[PDB]
Ligand binder design. Structure first.
Ligand code: HEM
Ligand SMILES: O=C1O[C@H]([C@@H](O)CO)C(O)=C1O
Ligand code: NA
Length: 250
């Protein structure tokens, strides 16, 4: 009941469905689901509840936001999706990029995340610096996800499981390597790899390791490593919330 979703026209809803189908095909065909999940996450994760600035309002299309250090490489994602966007002028970029994130999770075998249309494309990007620093720990994660975004500790741990997709690139973040052996499969392997410690061929960031040492995050890591269904449920809820920060709030 925290949300009151806006009414959109039947044509808007039809465009959502047709764009979803084109996104599902392209993301699968081009093997770019991890980059697209990151696109949606960096689009949404800048929301700060105290000023109601940032969040999933299409501003990743803005070159000034693409230029933020944390967004290196997301220009590729924007460009890859633009041919589809051109076919759906009625859709906001805000909705389109969140839809791409939902589809990325779907096509890699993850949960089906509800999608509600109607986000506006806002003119101003957030200030740079809202997104989490991979070198920091649990206090920082709580400031970013909790105090800025308004998400719970459960959401932090579940959403960290997005690292089951993809990898770090030395020219983008400067880190290098994948968290899992199957970076195109959405599963609970991220948590299993965390629990087993570091191993040759896989990467863990300090922000990932903070989940193991924190007394509230660690039981969630244990739960998700043992129970993929519980992970998918909590991930679905967290991703839904993330994708709607600042949007349709009652
Ligand atoms: C918890 C705090 C987080 C930190 C510190 C963090 C940090 C990073 C870093 C440094 C990269 C590498 C970027 C590159 O070099 O290409 C990355 C990639 C990625 N992140 Fe996170 N991230 C966090 C949370 C999230 C969340 C919440 C999601 C989505 C639910 C997510 C999804 C991804 C994905 C899918 C990639 C791989 C992208 C690719 O393979 O192109 N991350 N993250
Ligand atoms: O997930 C990704 O997709 C592309 C490439 O791997 C396939 O298009 C890209 O650069 C990634 O980070
Ligand atoms: Na994986």
């Amino acid at each position: 009941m925290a949300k009151s979703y806006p009414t959109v026209s039947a044509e808007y809803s039809e465009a959502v469905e047709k764009a979803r189908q084109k996104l599902r095909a392209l993301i699968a065909e081009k093997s770019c689901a991890p980059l697209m999940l990151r696109l949606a996450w960096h689009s949404a994760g800048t929301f700060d509840v105290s000023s109601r600035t940032g969040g999933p309002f299409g501003t990743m299309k803005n070159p000034a936001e693409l230029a933020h250090g944390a967004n290196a490489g997301l220009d590729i994602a924007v460009r890859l999706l633009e041919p589809i966007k051109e076919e759906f002028p009625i859709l906001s970029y805000a909705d389109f990029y969140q839809l791409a994130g939902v589809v990325a999770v779907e096509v890699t075998g993850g949960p089906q995340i509800p999608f509600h249309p109607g986000r506006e494309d806002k003119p101003q990007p957030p200030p740079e610096g809202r997104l989490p620093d991979a070198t920091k720990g649990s206090d920082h994660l709580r400031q970013v996800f909790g105090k800025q975004m308004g998400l719970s500790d459960q959401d932090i741990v579940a959403l960290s499981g997005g690292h089951t997709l993809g990898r770090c690139h030395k020219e983008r973040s400067g880190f290098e390597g994948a968290w899992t052996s199957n970076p195109l499969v959405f599963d609970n392997s991220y948590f299993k790899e965390l629990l087993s410690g570091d191993k040759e061929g896989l990467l863990q960031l300090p922000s990932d390791k903070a989940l193991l040492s924190d007394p509230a995050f660690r039981p969630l890591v244990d739960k998700y490593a043992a129970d993929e269904k519980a992970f998918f449920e909590d991930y679905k809820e967290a991703h839904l919330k993330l994708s709607e920060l600042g949007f349709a709030d009652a």
